[PDB]
Amino acid sequence: KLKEVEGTLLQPATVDNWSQIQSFEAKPDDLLICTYPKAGTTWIQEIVDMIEQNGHPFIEWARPPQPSGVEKAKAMPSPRILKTHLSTQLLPPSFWENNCKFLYVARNAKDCMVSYYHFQRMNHMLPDPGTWEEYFETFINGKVVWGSWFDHVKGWWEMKDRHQILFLFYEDIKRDPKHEIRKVMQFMGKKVDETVLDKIVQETSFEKMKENFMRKGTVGDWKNHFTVAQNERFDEIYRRKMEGTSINFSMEL
């Protein structure tokens, strides 16, 4: 079972808590970590946490009678670090009004499709994704929890021009983690200590975090999944959906 808000699939308890979620009061010093599912939430959260420490309430989460994500957030001392998978359309509007910091991480659509497929298989709280061939179409149509990859990324990319958004790419972090993590430290108003930065880079590698779903943690696993026929179909749909947007992704390391 899943419920919907404005046609976007969401966990039922989330939808039941929608009026509380939407009336959430943001604060100007909030830092909101925003990702489409599988674009790098676990990774970026670990990076932010290490930077804070140095060397988070899920706003839409609910599970009565336990405290909801917004109840937990309401009680958190500032500066609050929070997270969401909500699109710009569904985000509580107080975050826009308070000129909050947003840390957005994007990841290529093909690797997101693969990661989400395996996640739906291993996670009982997410629907059975069907065969790979079925899921391919499902994901392109956005019929997954938190909605379309395309709508998510386009919306957040558009907003970066008007709001305080540090817009990062998963593949850039994989390629040069020190370069990207330095940007997060600066965004968070931290004095960059090269020695602390170096520790964060080494401690947040896939290998370190995996030992302590962390599946493969690379770029380009999509090439192992997509047939050539699937790839040609995908590239055509992608061209149509992404037409006119200035965003570009890396597809391999």
Ligand SMILES: Nc1ncnc2c1ncn2[C@@H]1O[C@H](COP(=O)(O)O)[C@@H](OP(=O)(O)O)[C@H]1O
């Ligand atoms: N330290 C790390 N470095 C690189 N990728 C990581 C990572 N920790 C988690 N990931 C990857 O990020 C994806 C999970 O994203 P989210 O946290 O948004 O659900 C998974 O991708 P794969 O399924 O491609 O391995 C996961 O393996």
